[PDB]
């Protein structure tokens, strides 16, 4: 009957994101999915730092936070295990001992500079009490473009989901997925590879099966949102929680079990094109983080994507203690850091050996 | 088989927003939906004021903008036709000649103080070129609660939809609907009655049927998004465009036709509980804005909601001309305003008489 | 940059159903929304007749069912209170005393003939145990077209929702809404005004508030599905449950409360264009059905749509008892029927007086 | 603030279909995903046999149809290439030359019996003219459980999408996806592994890119519908079209381009858990079907799922011609058939040699 000439971009099937950065996004994804390597999450907020300087009793100052990063970044040879570093806004503008800004320092060593672009958690104000959303989309492109000029080529945004009474509200499931999807699009348009982090928190008395159920439910909606917004699959990365029992459940899971549940959930929700999955440690111990990732890279279940790490706590705990916040502790701190980095590097390769942590 | 104890608030059917401000939001809606009254939209941005100040060749200063606003906010007797005023952020802080801030000034005169809370249009960056989204959800509650303290009781947020090639992208239909829905929730939680404004623009060569189809499509997704975010229907208002032919279509619709198409489109998409629809003028001439509203209020079609106006251009055009800027044309300015406000007050009641309106009115489209 | 010529019907905003029957569908709606009139639901299945015939000692035969329908359809005077009658597939082909098929007989006497087109409830096989879906869409156009030929001008389809533990599953909320919307579209395309019936059953121990919550949640999705399918709003009717406490709640609700909750729920979910809402009695007594409808038509809440009845049990109970299935009880049964039809007629007008029912 | 005890099955996150047939379903997938083996699509309807017997002039009779399928089913040694066969309704009840039903015959021969359970295409009656939906969900569990009792362990259901003007309507995209997902669920509940077939037809002037876009769009929705209905991913299979230019586009794609586009589209839409993808020949020639599958199994792109075949035409065409419907032609026919079977078997392994195959294969598109 009646025909009409429309713009191809107005047709539902042609919603895939169009950006001149596509080629570079794929290249960054390539470097970020290097065998035997993972990411160092060093984007702790000024408030989280206070928590970090505790078992070592160090004051929370701008200078000490810079030394906190310098401890791990200026550690000779770390680029052997780390392919990218998620920096905090403050650290982006700080300089290493050699005078290079941290992004320049990383870029010179072949390490991709990354940046946490979200603006923190806030009450969801919908759904159930205790649920939270993430702010930061207003003025996003402006901020991202500036970070890109400073050398950053990838970013990270975190949304959280709190399991309560074995479930999570649909308000949270829908809203946080839309937030993550929009974030992915604005990032790619700004030239930064987006690390989409939908963390189903370990907090709670739930068992591994509950975590498995909620994680699958939360993750598949993130995927649906991403398809709605037309993300470039070849140009993004996922940063999920591992499927493990709750922190206050009193139950433990064998590495084989975590790998089974974690890998099964991912495969059941993620498109096979997803380039990589960089696990957050989120509450697991340094050894758990390594053992689990290792068992995950030994799973017989389908996992076409790169499975590695994007650890903060699981790579810093020991390094911080041995360092003690003192110069004389750098050598020991750096030794502690590289060891954890090496263990996780081998875990990525499925050759982790627990005896090495004995 | 297995049973589990969950919070009622975690179940899909219990997503309705819970706020202690509910009673107050409803009360405000009542005032905002008073027979024979509409809203004055004086929320033009600082930049937009440069577009209002061109014809009269006025200096775009903070003092002048205050006069621009005071020109009509102080015009005695206007509260007989205006039940609420949408103020710009800067005007909320300015004072009237009496020393009271406009919010305080308006309240004492019975006129509810409102505030435009959105942060402007930006490129959608999804869908088709030319489409735009609206920012402002970050730190919203913090801004809204502050406005509340200053006396504001309702807010306004505007999203736009550009008809191109007889259609709009779904990226735009979905995203702007979600933005508007979230906006409504945060406003109600902050104590401000939200005026949801999904404007399908008159820009383009599209005819009235194309505007009808697009408006229906856009509006229903806004309603769907509102249902998912659980808005309190009894406490919000809609500010839509009227369904009319495009500005460059070469055609002009008769009042009866615009009434039919507009009232029909609202009925097919809006829940019967929606307390009120406050039309934007969107480029129509001052007379058309009055003529069409009057016809709308004489439509035999279903319309349980209060139908009125929330005009900016269709209420300030001539009153601005007569004013010119000097306090000399103040009487002439406040005279042209009260007349336009009276014509629309009559329209709300469906008693508008074209014979009482100037026999000459040019489009306010740009 | 790139344009494409497509069919206007391929665009999302142009999904409204196109049918040459539109004008007739609206004309039918007008007759079914006539002040002081309602619908008689006489579409009981063979199995339901058993439940109606058992308590009066009447054998369930093809002949006794016809006599069961004749009892009401030939109660001269009922046309004054009944604008339409929902017939069972069997009755459509039966004949009244004068040799006319019931549809012909009804049409000749000013009543619009309708037909129940759904094929029964079945286990949902998704969501929670006890939930059911409704079959009937396969070959629907063929059946509906045959009905139109015989004189039917509107139809009815029933889906049910069972409140369990104060909630219902999304699987049911979504699936049944999609079933109803598809059914509405196919009915209109066939020239039959569709009566959409999403019955939130009174069964259970829930209070009126829970019914309100579930009814609003169920209603809204039915509407959403109708919008996605592009139904002609000016050509359909809703046949919902009134909002009242559960049948096993041991709680009673005053007429004014039912009216407030019911009218408020419709207003919050139904587009103002919906032409009419014909309530099902669903377990309420004959008196509650009249009392509640009467209060609904006296409610100060918004209600652009016509509010009337589409009752089965609430119009048949007393009549079946007085009739006793005996030709010698016809006069008594018909007086009871007319009385009940009369009470609901005055209820539609908001002039029902409880004293009239003693 | 208040709590409530509900069934776990009432919560959104717990919607995975639960069936006692899960184990057997997965076991069945394992059989249907055996390296070097594919499926034989012999579910042609009586009306579809009319056009297949047209060439060799064979009367469409229950008997002639029985032999037509026996030709391939009783082809000695075909089990080395075929893991399962999709039968038509009547063939399920017909008998092999040894007196036992084909299902019993195939089972004893290590082959899995399958049944096509859809009731055919019908006008969509929504969206655009030319679009079709598929009927068959009414009384499904009853029919399916009947087939299961007769030996069947998997089924097939086909929905089609027609590219027109470079696109398809959302009405079709949504409705056909929901139909497939409900079909999948009812199938698993009846103990049958469902092969979900969303065919974006090769018909049209469109190029490979338009087919890619449309296929991506259509398939992701099927996936969305499957997640909403809670399908058991570990127990189902997908049967899509390959991404190739239209039959009337005038262009023909090189094996490796088809591989790139097809695999890329699958990876962007399908969850990594999806057991396998059994392609349809959809009109391609016998050799094209084999070449493309070979190139597909040689793609460097991510593809965790078993990629194989489930052809009807591309496997029967020449074998049928050789048979001629004559008894003396059974040998000639079964050689051609077992040949094509071997070719696709190699293609499944990415070890297909174009040399070892015919030199000229005509289009099977009508
Ligand atoms: O609360 P803040 O100051 O905003 O910091 C958050 C930041 O540490 C996290 O987003 C990590 O990047 C990520 O969750 C992996 O960390 P682990 O879960 O492996 O410890
Ligand atoms: O361009 P800005 O600075 O964002 O301000 C726009 C604002 O004045 C309008 O949106 C009114 O609130 C309303 O929509 C009526 O406008 P008219 O359509 O009646 O002119
Ligand atoms: O279960 P069946 O044998 O198919 O028949 C059901 C049928 O009587 C009802 O669906 C009515 O059409 C309507 O719902 C009003 O019924 P009441 O609730 O007013 O009695
Ligand atoms: O006309 P009907 O009765 O609906 O039967 C069609 C049926 O043979 C096909 O759909 C196959 O099951 C499969 O899709 C492979 O088809 P091709 O490989 O020949 O393209």
DSSP D217-275: HHHHHHHHHHHHTT--GGG-EE--------TTSS----HHHHHHHHHHHHHHHSBTT--
Q: D4 and B12 in contact by Cβ < 8 A?
A: no
Q: How far apart are CA D69 and CA D71, in angstroms?
A: 5
Distance from CA of B269 to the nearest CA of C (A): 5
Ligand that comes closest to the CA of residue B46: 2
Q: How far apart are CA C318 and CA C66, in angstroms?
A: 19
No. of helices (H) and no. of strands (E), chain A = 12, 11
Determine the Cα–Cα distance for residues A304 and A275; give it in Å rounded to an integer: 8
Biggest CA–CA distance in chain C, Å, is 82
Q: Characterize C108-144 residue by residue with b for buried, 16 or more Cβ atoms within 10 angstroms of its Cβ, and e for exposed.
A: eeebbbbbbbbbeeeebbbbbebbbbbbbbbebbebb
β pairing state of B121-123 and B132-134: antiparallel
> Among B121, B137, B98, which residue's Cα sits nearest to residue B45?
B121
Distance from C-alpha of A280 to C-alpha of A201, rounded to nearest angstrom: 11
Neighbouring C-alpha atoms within 13 Å toward the C-beta of A174: 15
Query: Is the CB of B20 inside 8 Å of chain D's CB atoms?
Result: no
Distance between CA atoms of residues A122 and A136, nearest Å: 11
Mutate to test the interface with A, among C3, C167, C171 (most CBs of A within 10 A): C3
For each of the domains in chain B, give its residue range(s) and CATH number, in order of start. 1-366 (3.20.20.70)
**E strand or H helix at B161:** strand B154-161
User: In 10 A of CB D203, how many CB atoms?
Assistant: 17
How many CB atoms within 10 Å of residue C247? 16
Strand spans (E) along A60-206:
82-87, 112-116, 121-123, 132-134, 154-161, 193-200
Look up residue D130 and give its two tokens: 């030319």
From the CA of A21, how far away is ligand 4's center (Å)?
43
Pairing between β-strand D132-134 and β-strand D306-311 as defined by DSSP bridges: unpaired
DSSP state of A271: B
DSSP class per residue in A31-59: HHT-TT-EEEE----HHHHHHHTTTTT--
**D24 CA: distance to closest CA in chain B (Å):** 23
Residue A343 near residue A318, CB atoms below 8 Å: no
D152: left (phi over 0), alpha (psi -120 to 50) or beta: beta
Residue C149: partners with Cβ closer than 8 Å, 6 or more residues away: none
Quick check: D199 and D131 in contact, CB under 8 A?
no
Nearest to A165 among B4, B141, B166 (CB): B4
Could you tell me how far CA C183 lies from the centroid of its own chain? 14
Residue A339: partners with Cβ closer than 8 Å, 6 or more residues away: A318
The 3-class SS string of C32-76 reads HCCCCCEEEEECCCHHHHHHHHHHHCCCCCHHHHHHHHHHHHCCC
d(CA B92, CA B156): 14
In sequence order, what are the residues at sequence separation of 6 or more whose Cβ sits closer than 8 angstroms to the Cβ of residue B91? Answer: B42, B43, B65, B66, B69, B102
**CB-neighbour burial class of residue B89 (10 A; exposed 0-12, middle 13-18, buried 19+):** middle
Asked if residue C205 lies in contact with residue D47, where contact means CB atoms within 8 angstroms, the answer is no
Closest CA to C161 of C302, C280, C323, C44: C280
Which among B146, B195, B154 is positioned nearest to B24, based on CA atoms? B154
φ and ψ at residue C62, rounded to 5 degrees: -55, -25
The answer to whether residue D256 is catalytic is no
Nearest Cα residue to A42 out of A27, A33, A52, A34: A52
Across the interface, do C138 and D141 touch by the CB < 8 Å criterion?
no
Contact, D141 vs C125, CB < 8 A?
yes
* Whole-number Å distance between alpha carbons of C99 and C90: 16
Atom in ligand 3 nearest the alpha carbon of residue C316 = 20
Ligand 4 atom closest to the CA of D283, numbered from 1: 20
Phi then psi dihedrals of residue A283, to 5 deg: 115, -20
DSSP C185-244: HHHHHTT-EEEEEEEE---SS--HHHHHHHHHHHHHHHHHHHHHTT--GGG-EE------
Q: Give Cβ neighbours of residue A117 (< 8 Å, ≥ 6 apart).
A: A136, A140, A143, A144, A147, A155, A156, A157, A183, A187, A192
Cβ atoms of residues C132 and C180 within 8 Å: no
Experimental method: X-ray
Say which residues have a Cβ less than 8 Å from residue B121's Cβ, sequence separation at least 6.
B132, B133, B134, B158, B160
Under a CB-based contact definition with an 8 Å cutoff, are residues D316 and D325 in contact? no
Residues 6 or more apart in contact with residue B233 via CB below 8 angstroms: B226, B271, B273, B274, B275, C267, C268
B interface mutation test: which of C273, C303, C304 has the most B CBs within 10 A?
Answer: C273
Nearest CA owner, ligand 1 atom 10 = A158
**Which mutation among C38, C43, C240 tests ligand 3's pocket best, with the greatest number of atoms within 8 A of CB?**
C43
* Angstroms from A100 CA to nearest CA on chain D: 39
User: Does D295 sit in the ligand 4 pocket, CB within 6 Å?
Assistant: no
Q: Resolution in angstroms, to 1 decimal, for this deposition?
A: 1.9
Pairing type for strands B38-42 and D38-42 reads unpaired
Least Cα distance to C347 among C235, C229, C258 occurs for: C258
**What is the rounded CA–CA span in Å between residue D341 and residue C332?**
78
Q: Which 8-state DSSP code applies to residue D3?
A: E
Token pair for residue A164?
Answer: 């309560």
* Strand residue runs (E) in chain C: 3-7, 38-42, 82-87, 112-116, 121-123, 132-134, 154-161, 193-200, 237-238, 276-279, 306-311
Distances in whole angstroms, Cα of residue D240 to Cα of each of B258, D121, D134, D202, D257: 48, 17, 16, 12, 17
Distance from residue A289's CA to the centre of ligand 1 (Å): 14
CB neighbour burial string for A202-226, b if at least 16 within 10 angstroms, e if fewer:
bbbbbbbebbbbbbbbbbbbbbbbb
Q: What is the DSSP letter of A80?
A: G
Strands D38-42 and D3-7: unpaired
| Identified catalytic residue from D131, D197, D199, D286 | D197
Q: Are D355 and D277 in contact (CB under 8 A)?
A: no
Taking the CA of residue B125 as centre, how many other CA atoms within 13 Å lie in the half-sphere pointing to its CB?
21
CA distances from B279 to B196, B228, B309, C341 (A): 11, 25, 5, 44
Interface C-D, measured as beta-carbon pairs within 8 A, has a size of: 97
CB atoms within 10 A of CB B298: 16
- Output the CA B312–ligand 2 centroid distance in Å: 6
Q: State which H helix or E strand residue A7 sits in.
A: strand A3-7
CA of B41 to the centre of ligand 2 (A): 7
Asked if B2's CB is within 8 angstroms of D5's CB, the reply is: no
Q: How many CB atoms lie within 10 A of CB C277?
A: 23
Q: Is B205 a catalytic residue?
A: no
**CB of C202 within 8 A of CB of C284?**
yes
Q: Cα separation of B342 and B317, whole Å?
A: 15
């Amino acid at each position: 009957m009646s025909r009409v000439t429309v713009l191809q971009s107005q047709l539902p099937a042609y919603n895939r994101l169009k950006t001149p950065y596509e080629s570079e996004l794929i290249a960054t994804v390539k470097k970020l999915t290097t065998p035997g390597k993972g990411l160092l999450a060093a984007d702790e907020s000024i408030g989280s730092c206070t928590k970090r300087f505790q078992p070592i009793g160090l004051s929370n100052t701008e200078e000490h936070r810079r030394q906190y990063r310098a401890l791990m970044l200026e550690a000779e040879g770390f680029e052997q295990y780390i392919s990218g570093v998620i920096l905090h806004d403050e650290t982006v503008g700080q300089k290493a001992s050699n005078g290079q800004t941290f992004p320049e320092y990383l870029t010179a060593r072949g390490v991709v500079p990354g940046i946490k672009t979200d603006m923190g958690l806030c009450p969801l104000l919908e759904g159930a009490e205790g649920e939270q959303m993430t702010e930061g989309l207003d003025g996003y492109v402006k901020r991202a473009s500036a970070y890109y000029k400073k050398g950053c080529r990838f970013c990270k945004w975190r949304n959280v989901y709190k399991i309560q009474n074995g479930t999570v509200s649909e308000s949270a499931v829908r809203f946080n997925a839309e937030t993550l999807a929009r974030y992915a699009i604005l990032s790619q348009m700004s030239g930064l590879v987006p690390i989409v982090e939908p963390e189903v928190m370990i907090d709670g008395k739930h068992d591994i099966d509950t975590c498995q159920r909620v994680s699958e439910h939360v993750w598949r909606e993130v995927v649906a949102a991403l398809q709605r917004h037309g993300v470039i699959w070849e140009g993004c990365l996922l940063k999920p929680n591992m499927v493990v029992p709750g922190a206050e459940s009193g139950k433990t899971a064998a590495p084989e079990q975590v790998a089974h549940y974690t890998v099964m959930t991912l495969a059941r929700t993620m498109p096979a094109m997803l380039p990589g999955v960089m696990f957050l440690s989120g509450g697991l111990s340094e050894v758990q983080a390594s053992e689990y990732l290792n068992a995950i890279n030994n799973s017989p279940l389908p996992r076409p994507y790169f499975l590695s790490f994007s650890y903060a706590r699981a790579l810093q705990s020991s390094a911080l203690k041995a360092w003690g916040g003192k110069e004389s502790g750098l050598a020991a701190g750096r030794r502690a850091f590289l060891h954890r980095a090496r263990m996780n590097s081998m875990a990525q390769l499925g050759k982790y050996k627990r005896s090495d942590d004995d």
